[PDB]
Paper text:
The membrane (M) protein is the most abundant structural protein of coronaviruses including MERS-CoV, SARS-CoV, and SARS-CoV-2, and plays a central role in virus assembly through its interaction with various partner proteins. In coronaviruses, M protein is the only multispanning transmembrane structural protein and has been shown to interact with various partner proteins, including all viral structural proteins (S, M, E, and N) and some host factors involved in the interferon signaling pathway such as MAVS. Here, we present the first crystal structure of a betacoronavirus M protein from Pipistrellus bat coronavirus HKU5 (batCOV5-M), which is closely related to MERS-CoV, SARS-CoV, and SARS-CoV-2 M proteins. The batCOV5-M protein is closely related to MERS-M, and to a lesser extent, SARS-M and SARS2-M, sharing 95, 75 and 74% sequence homology, respectively.
Our next strategy was to crystallize the cytosolic carboxy-terminal domain (CTD) of batCOV5-M (batCOV5-MCTD) and solve its structure, which may serve as a searching template for molecular replacement of the full-length batCOV5-M. Interestingly, four batCOV5-MCTD-sfGFP molecules assemble into a tetramer in the structure, consistent with its oligomeric state in solution as verified by a cross-linking experiment. In the batCOV5-MCTD-sfGFP structure, the MCTD domains swapping β strands with each other, resembling a “butterfly” shape. Three monomer conformations of MCTD were then extracted from the tetramer: conformer 1 with the β sandwich split into three parts, conformer 2 with two parts, and conformer 3 as an assembled MCTD (batCOV5-MCTD-xtal). Though it is tempting to postulate that domain swapping of CTD may play a role in regulating the M–M protein interaction, further investigation is required. Meanwhile, we tried to solve the full-length batCOV5-M structure by molecular replacement using the three CTD conformations as templates, and eventually succeeded with the batCOV5-MCTD-xtal structure. Meanwhile, alignment between the batCOV5-MCTD-xtal structure and CTD of the batCOV5-Mxtal structure yielded an all-atom RMSD of only 0.5 Å, indicating that the individually expressed CTD of batCOV5-M protein preserves its structure. However, it is noteworthy that the CTD dimer interface in the batCOV5-MCTD-sfGFP structure is different from that in the batCOV5-Mxtal structure.
Residue numbers in the entry:
A (entry chain A), D (entry chain A): 2 to 64, 68 to 232, 242 to 322
B (entry chain B), C (entry chain B): 2 to 64, 68 to 235, 242 to 322
Write the structure that this text describes.
């Protein structure tokens, strides 16, 4: 689709949000850049007022899905870049479990060669003492997200991407004929007598773990290795000529529980044009929250990678 | 210590609970066996009344810590088996966050060669549409516990233990010169050119130094010292000399079906049933791993529990 | 194991070394006693020739690992005391970074009730103005070792052990409303208003996942797995079945006087002196802490050594 | 002294260095701000050429000592701010042990309200395979510096400063009548029988550690606590109307040793004016090296605190 070509390279991003939550007024401004080729997003956000009413993770989602990486086979389903350069409007309602709701309206458009995202956010009935207003959330986007980075050295340069768990792996340690596997003592066993296959029993799946590598630390001691909703669900909305998306975010609260955020969103094109009405699909998002060490004002540094499926 | 010898082998276990939660009467009876040598507990519980008003995970804790494996150096701190064969009494108060409370009193004693744990439970101020009374909990003991089993075939027989899942592992897939590491697209790379080592950058972790001592040298002058101590899911056990027993604290994060977790604040105290020299333990804790399953051919509301407890 | 019983108590030790470093002949003789129960080694060494061409820390290692304390679970891996009373032979090669090398052969055996360690040492290609021959080293075994002693009075007698200095501690000084924490000016603060907890932010540490297995699915396609293993200063000991002995590796960072450190790459191998069933150990290591002092009333070039070795 | 008043507040800093080491040409440009009140320095440096010939720690020193915090009693000895706003010239010779030398000439002056530091650096005979050119240094300024940060919450805001060791502290753990103190087993002892004072024997000082706090973990088990060249040496140089300074930097190299850097420097005022000729004293410096997480070009983020004595 024409209009996605302006996302071939890196695009500068400017985000401007004005929010008032339960009588607390604030405004956030963020700048950075997005590489739609890999789904890379590097942004820095600052509260212009100073005082932060809500914790960053609640509005991380609310704070440019056009930079989502759409693989080639579904390139005919990317509504976001097809709405560009005229842009689209994104309306969100975020219901926090045992708390109030956010209602947000944003315009994502192109100003010259920059990508501007302007938001109006309002909080309706949020408890003044709660996980939201009490900043009790653990500076984490979702509970299933590892906030770690993974650096792969390739051709002299390290490539850094968020870290997902792609499979299950269990290590076995045999000492003088006694086996300890996954923090449990399995009793007497000889290192040579370690099985080639081990089984794991999930409430629905029977997984088989095969021995990958073994190393002998002694005559009878050694080590062996055995190995084998969250996403944003997007559907089309022909009557409004846009898309409707649903998802849930489980913010880690400090006391061990999680705060639920039900995101219901709908996007409609800003100007008359032929947008791509997609099939039902989803976006997988991975986020890493850090802070600028030399920065003193209340800020957030975001690294985000989105892919489609 | 005498009285711990009765746990050298496998011991048959009988658990009997009569509960009343928000005016809902029920009774659970369970049978099985425990091997204190490995900390193994294998039991099957059935609701005799039939329909269970609260979900099984809420009562897993209330439904025999004597079978906890105490290592040799801590064998002088196992109060539970030292109270035997006369037994002890276990009083629990379970405060559920944003919900009611359980108050339970149980007697754990030896009846003949069987180990009987008899419980009276009462649940108060429970929301009828709450997670507890609504069975909204996800049939999981704790959120950090994987309810999976790990079976290792050894010497012709498979040995089954709970899954701890503490390892870290990343898989790399190179297809036609493009690399995918842990479900992410890393770009162009050749398989032979894959690096021998990869690095992971964990989030900055903040070591906490607590104020140890303070001394005031003046009206607005003084000195303070901050230091890191030598030491959430585990059951923290302390002695209670004045009552000649033990007091334990912990928290359990039950998985709620919608993705959240329900907190259960367990505050318990155990005191010996009969006059005797019990072991007054030092501060320690029990690490517990539990697996909940169901008999596919069973019709009554039931729970099959496998549990492993260790001390530290 | 038989032969380790000879180390139940304190054993008198005699060490005798004849060395030739770059054509410089010298001889060191040392006496003392070792308590294998605690890993204690207390010796006094004197250069019989008088002036020592190389500094004492270089020869501390070359100058009886049988006195290393092996815990109960590792008592089947202590090759040194298992080779006794016939003894073993210890061959060492010490490569000093940007300097020459030591080649040493020693016999550690039992002469009567004494434990004798006899050494032949040869030093080759040493810079005459180098750190070694110039005595530029700072009379320290390793740079991470504090040469301090810690004396705890217990039951009327002080017990002395080397200082490990592994704790972290920060002191706060408030003067007239201004705060100083760890030698830094933190600005205005009131002593009563001092926080209960302070946080320290350590530098980002990079966990390393090594490639465990690789399998090629095509010309430019394959799969790789990266994982973190379960496990520098310590002496790493491995078995050597083909030679029926052990081989050990380690590195020692001697403190140079100008602030730098001189590296000493120790590669050693021990083989039993007499025919017998020695213990072929699993891979393990020895953690060593040494304290070097001098007798103030002594005139000959000497060294007083206190050493504690443990296994893991 | 007049002219130090312009350092009462925060001053923007711009650093420009052109270096050629053993035929490798590069240029570094850095920007940030310095607060002379507390000695705070927050800077970010970037290699403009791309390819970094030498590791950052070697030139960290070479890359604005006017921001050094001089306490009140020695405020008559601060030559640096007394040379301002006209500035001074700083000449350095840095001899690396078992390697060549750096020769650097810099002008530290005021351009408007900004503080400009312009440097010419040249490396004479540095081994191509060495700790310097091989980037073998451990991203650490000095071996005695802990690269950690210490955050003290005061009045709702955390103050972050480099972490020094101000005293010696030893913890004792008694379990069932056996004592382990500072990673050593002292044998049998009862927790109630723990001594009030412990002694430490240094090669020159006999330190006494008193018990600070004790906590009982059981009937006979518990824990107790016992507690009790690098700097830049500056002298005056009347004949040249400036100062001469000496110091040594022990960079941690990766293999465990340290690389020595002998800094010999001299500062002379740029313009005719009454500078302060100081008594012999020294500056204590603490540095923390980090990196901007969203930054990809070869960069360094520096936090530095200097005090006088």
């Amino acid at each position: 689709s024409k209009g996605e070509e302006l996302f071939t390279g890196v695009v500068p991003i400017l985000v401007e949000l004005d929010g008032d939550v339960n009588g607390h007024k604030f405004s956030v401004r963020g700048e950075g850049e997005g590489d739609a080729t890999n789904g890379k997003l590097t942004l820095k956000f600052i509260c212009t007022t100073g005082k932060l009413p809500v914790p960053w993770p609640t509005l991380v989602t609310t704070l440019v899905q056009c930079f989502s990486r759409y693989p080639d086979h579904m390139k005919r389903h990317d509504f976001f870049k097809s709405a560009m350069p005229e842009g689209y409007v994104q309306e969100r309602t975020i219901s926090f479990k045992d708390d109030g709701t956010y209602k947000t309206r944003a315009e994502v458009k192109f100003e010259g060669d920059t990508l501007v995202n302007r938001i109006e956010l309002k909080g309706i009935d949020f408890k003044e003492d709660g996980n939201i207003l009490g900043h009790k959330l653990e500076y984490n986007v979702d509970t299933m997200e590892s906030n770690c980075l993974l650096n792969v050295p390739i051709g002299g340069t390290t490539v850094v991407r968020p870290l997902v768990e792609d499979s299950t792996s269990v290590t076995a340690v045999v000492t003088d004929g006694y086996l300890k596997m996954a923090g449990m003592h399995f009793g007497a066993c000889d290192f040579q007598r370690l099985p080639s296959e081990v089984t794991v029993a999930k409430p629905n799946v029977l997984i088989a773990l095969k021995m990958i590598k073994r190393q002998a630390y002694g005559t009878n001691s050694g080590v062996a290795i055995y190995h084998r909703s969250h996403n944003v669900y997007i559907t089309a909305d022909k009557q409004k000529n846009g898309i409707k998306a649903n998802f849930k975010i489980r913010h880690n609260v400090e006391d061990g529980s999680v705060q639920l955020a039900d995101h219901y969103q709908q996007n409609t094109p800003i100007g008359d044009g032929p947008v791509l009405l997609p099939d039902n699909h989803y976006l997988s998002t991975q986020s890493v929250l850090s802070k600028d060490p030399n920065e003193k004002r209340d800020h957030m540094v975001l690294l985000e990678f989105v892919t489609a499926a």
